[PDB]
Amino acid sequence: HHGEASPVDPLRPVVDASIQPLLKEHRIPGMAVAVLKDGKAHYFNYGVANRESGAGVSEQTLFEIGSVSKTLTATLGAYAVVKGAMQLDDKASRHAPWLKGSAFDSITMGELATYSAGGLPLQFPEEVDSSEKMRAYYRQWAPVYSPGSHRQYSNPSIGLFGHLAASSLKQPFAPLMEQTLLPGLGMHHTYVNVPKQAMASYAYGYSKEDKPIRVNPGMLADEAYGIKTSSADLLRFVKANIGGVDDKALQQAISLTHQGHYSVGGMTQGLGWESYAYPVTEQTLLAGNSAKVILEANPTAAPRESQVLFNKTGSTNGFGAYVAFVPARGIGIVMLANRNYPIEARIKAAHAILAQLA
Ligand SMILES: O=c1[nH]cnc2c1ncn2[C@@H]1O[C@H](COP(=O)(O)O)[C@@H](O)[C@H]1O
Numbered sequence: 001h002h003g004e005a006s007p008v009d010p011l012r013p014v015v016d017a018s019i020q021p022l023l024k025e026h027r028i029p030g031m032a033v034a035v036l037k038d039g040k041a042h043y044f045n046y047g048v049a050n051r052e053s054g055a056g057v058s059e060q061t062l063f064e065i066g067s068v069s070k071t072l073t074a075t076l077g078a079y080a081v082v083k084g085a086m087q088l089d090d091k092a093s094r095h096a097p098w099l100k101g102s103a104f105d106s107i108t109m110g111e112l113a114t115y116s117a118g119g120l121p122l123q124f125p126e127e128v129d130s131s132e133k134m135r136a137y138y139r140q141w142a143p144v145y146s147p148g149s150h151r152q153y154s155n156p157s158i159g160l161f162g163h164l165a166a167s168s169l170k171q172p173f174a175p176l177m178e179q180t181l182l183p184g185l186g187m188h189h190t191y192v193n194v195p196k197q198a199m200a201s202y203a204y205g206y207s208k209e210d211k212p213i214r215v216n217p218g219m220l221a222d223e224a225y226g227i228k229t230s231s232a233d234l235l236r237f238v239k240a241n242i243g244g245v246d247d248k249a250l251q252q253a254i255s256l257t258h259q260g261h262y263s264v265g266g267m268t269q270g271l272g273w274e275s276y277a278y279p280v281t282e283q284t285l286l287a288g289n290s291a292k293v294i295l296e297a298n299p300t301a302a303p304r305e306s307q308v309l310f311n312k313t314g315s316t317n318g319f320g321a322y323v324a325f326v327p328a329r330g331i332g333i334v335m336l337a338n339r340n341y342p343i344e345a346r347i348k349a350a351h352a353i354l355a356q357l358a
Pocket of ligand 1: 066067068123294313314315316340
């Protein structure tokens with residue numbers, strides 16, 4: 001593009017410098033990046049959302065955000081607490097009569113939400129593919145560790161939290177999210193189920209073999225990893241986590257998601273969000289989002305006392321997302337890609353960029 005005026009945004013060089021090497025090293029088809037600094041949103045877009053249409057990524061493009069969905073599910077659960085429909089210390093079986101008589105008689109909602117129920121696995125067994133089979137699974141599940149003693153990152157765990165929280169509010173999860181929570185957060189281009197008039201904005205994800213894919217139906221997918229959103233809407237969620245929102249209950253719920261429950265190394269587990277003392281070393285950020293913390297059971301330690309960085313990774317077969325923000329400095333970044341590229345690469349880039357914004 002020799003001879004064209006280069007974009008005027010003073011932040012473009014900093015973002016490009018971190019993001020462009022990323023796109024070529026890991027062959028990422030497209031990425032939407034959004035940055036907050038000094039009360040203003042900046043969007044930087046790269047590549048293609050859909051190789052069939054050849055359409056470019058924009059801040060309106062919908063990506064699967066995988067486990068970043070857990071921050072929204074956590075916020076819904078916090079909302080149920082604010083509204084008085086449940087408490088984090090409730091036994092899970094209080095919100096599900098079909099759980100009475102199982103181990104979930106003695107496991108709290110809080111423990112489900114923070115993956116510390118006692119060894120619930122990362123994914124459901126592949127056999128569990130219906131509501132009836134799901135219920136049977138939980139009723140037979142044998143705890144591996146005592147409640148609260150270990151963190152084992154788990155979709156069945158946070159998934160069950162979201163499900164029972166919606167049930168305490170007497171509405172199914174997806175309509176509760178789409179009709180109550182998301183609008184109150186000002187996320188009007190965010191969906192559990194992408195409707196027809198929004199399907200055109202929905203990117204394709206691309207596998208390692210560069211085949212187009214989107215997330216597969218699974219049990220509690222909505223609760224655990226099912227949100228589609230744009231970079232602009234996710235940046236709005238970041239702003240909601242910094243400056244707040246007009247709905248008073250939703251305001252409280254947001255604050256509740258920031259409260260620490262326990263730590264693993266330098267990472268403190270909140271509801272959905274994971275947090276760090278800021279400024280934070282790259283090695284600490286890397287460690288808290290490492291395979292060790294993600295895949296294996298880790299003992300819970302005392303939470304960090306209440307400047308803080310909040311983050312959450314999210315991945316599906318075809319997508320890779322990351323969000324991090326620092327309320328005390330009014331900075332944040334959202335990175336949404338349609339390839340599942342390594343978590344370490346996301347953190348290194350985000351960390352580099354945030355440091356410049358600060
Ligand atoms: O079932 C699994 N087995 C092994 N790794 C997984 C599984 N599910 C997700 N992951 C990976 O675990 C990491 C954390 O996922 P995230 O929290 O959704 O970003 C990502 O690298 C995922 O691709």
